């Protein structure tokens, strides 16, 4: 799959594909990778199991439930249990959580990354999806939502693993 | 009527060396107590003690201060550690208990200090019933009302030939515990100890700093934090249930204690931040502070030596230098070693006198010199061999 977050000005944004692959074959072409947490305040991706995320995203934002809302402090403690307990080390999948204080990628090695200039693309895609969306965000005026998406089509139609099928999510501020 | 802070800091360098600050602060808070009497109804419920954390290694005088403290204001002290309610997420115990605990010491207190500020009396009192008993002498009237009033005259005389003379003796002392009891009221001297408690009451709270956090593990960071949650209403101000009554906490002193090398004192709980205001740090000892604790302080170990050997007719003296070949033996063994503060001057100071405390009793009448030579032909060799170190000091 392929996740792809982007900020510019005061919006930032986190696309995602709709295929799910088994095998050589297309299991579904419509999953949803991205979705809202903590009231809406943040803005989530995930690239693996439809479940496991779903396990993840609440944990994480039960993070920010008692820890102000601190996005990066709730991160790097979610990582920690994520990393620890025999449940949550159970379950693998790229995490992709974005706010309007920062971006960042979250992974099973208890790893709190934030790449560059809040640039994300996780995901069988992410190389490609990063690729244009750097040469954008460098040659254009470009939306941060106009570059998230058209980097994501340009991934799609590299990536055997990514469909055409977006789920956006945005955050101005 | 209290002593200013640098009267109290004076009385505290007449037992502790150096750390200064620590004594300074530790001296604000006493003064407060006394400045807050000094005011309206109103503020003296607003104004809360000004609770103190000390940061500083092992061993450096930071339980001391605070008992020293305690005692220069007659203060019921007690110390706890921080960790042992940790232990509660199995049976452990409840921290409540601390002011439980605190109030028995407190009661002991307040017994024994009145069982002492009676014993007097109680002796003269019992005197009068023994003399009682050799003579009813002169009563009302009997005699005279001037020259054959008094009726001491043999009584006087049997008096003395008693004091410096059933069993007179075997009996005074069941009239000293029959006539101090009757002389006790159990009910004022049980919310004796409660108002000290509640007014001067000192608390020291050791090994605050382990029970902070670190992302090590869920469950024991749960703990931990609990025995600080559950420290709160002591330090914000609460009523605790007491085998000899109810205690209000919101005046009692609490000196918090942490090394802090792992954790910080920021990690701690922001409740429990806000009721430590007073920060404080302490210095670890030199070899030069060792020196001073092995003499200066008025009751020093090595005064304290003097005295028991003196006991047995031996005159003990040590030499400035045996006295710094001592420091540097303490010293070189917390380094070469594991380090262990001033308390290691103790283990060294009663190994070098091993032979003599046991010879102590035949030498009577000598005149012992502990000097430089004397302390390395029998200290040296354990110094040097470190594996003998940590059995044999």
């Known amino acids: ?173 | 009527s209290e002593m200013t802070p640098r009267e109290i800091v004076s009385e505290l360098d007449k037992h502790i060396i150096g750390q200064d600050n620590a004594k300074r602060s530790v001296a604000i808070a006493l003064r407060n107590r006394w400045r807050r009497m000094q005011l309206n109804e109103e503020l003296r419920h607003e104004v809360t003690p000004k609770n103190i954390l000390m940061i500083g290694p092992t061993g450096v005088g930071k339980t001391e201060i605070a008992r020293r403290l305690a005692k220069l204001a007659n203060a019921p002290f007690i110390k706890v550690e921080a960790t042992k309610f940790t232990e509660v997420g199995y049976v452990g115990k409840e921290v409540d208990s601390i002011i439980r605990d605190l109030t028995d010491a407190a009661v002991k207190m307040v017994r024994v200090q009145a069982i002492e500020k009676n014993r007097y009396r109680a002796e003269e009192l019992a005197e009068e019933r023994i003399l009682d008993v050799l003579i009813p002498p002169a009563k009302n009237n009997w005699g005279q009302t001037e020259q054959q009033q008094e009726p001491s005259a043999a009584r006087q005389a049997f008096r003395k030939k008693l004091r410096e003379g059933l069993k007179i003796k075997d009996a005074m002392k069941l009239l000293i515990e029959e006539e101090a009891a009757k002389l006790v009221n159990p009910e004022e001297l049980k919310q004796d100890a409660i108002d000290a408690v509640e007014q001067h009451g000192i608390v020291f709270i050791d090994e605050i700093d382990k029970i902070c956090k670190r992302g090590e593990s869920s469950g024991p960071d749960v703990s931990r934090e609990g025995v600080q949650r559950d420290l709160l209403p002591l330090v914000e101000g609460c009523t605790v249930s007491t085998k000899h009554g109810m205690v209000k906490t919101d005046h009692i002193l609490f000196i918090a204690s942490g090394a802090f090398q792992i954790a910080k004192p920021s990690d701690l709980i922001p409740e429990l931040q806000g009721r430590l205001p007073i920060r404080v740090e302490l210095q670890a000892l030199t070899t030069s502070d060792f020196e001073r604790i092995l003499t200066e302080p008025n009751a020093s170990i090595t005064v304290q030596y003097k005295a028991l050997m003196a006991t047995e007719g031996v005159n003990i003296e040590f030499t400035d230098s045996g006295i710094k070949r001592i420091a540097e033996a303490a010293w070189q063994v917390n380094e070469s070693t594991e380090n262990i503060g001033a308390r290691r001057l103790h283990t060294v100071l009663e190994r070098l006198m091993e032979e003599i405390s046991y010879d102590a009793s035949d030498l009577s009448g000598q005149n012992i010199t502990i000097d430089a030579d004397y302390v390395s032909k029998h200290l040296d060799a354990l110094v040097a061999d470190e594996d003998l170190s940590r059995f044999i000091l």
């Open chain 1, 1 to 173: 799959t392929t996740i792809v977050s982007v900020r510019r000005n005061g919006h930032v944004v986190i696309a995602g594909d709709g295929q799910a692959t088994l095998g050589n074959t297309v299991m579904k072409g419509n999953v949803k990778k991205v979705r809202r947490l903590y009231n809406d305040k943040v803005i989530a991706g995930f690239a693996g199991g439809t479940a496991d995320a779903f396990t993840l995203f609440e944990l994480f934002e039960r993070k920010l439930e008692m820890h102000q809302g601190h996005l990066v402090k709730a991160a790097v403690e979610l990582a920690k249990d994520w990393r620890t307990d025999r449940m949550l080390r159970k379950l693998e999948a790229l995490l992709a959580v974005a706010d309007e204080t920062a971006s960042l990628i979250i992974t099973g090695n208890g790893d709190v990354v934030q790449p560059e200039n809040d640039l994300i693309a996780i995901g069988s895609g992410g190389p490609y999806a990063q690729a244009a969306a750097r040469a954008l965000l460098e040659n254009t005026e470009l939306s941060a939502r106009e570059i998230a998406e058209k980097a994501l089509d340009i991934a799609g139609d590299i990536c055997i693993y990514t469909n055409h099928f977006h789920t956006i999510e945005e955050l101005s501020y």
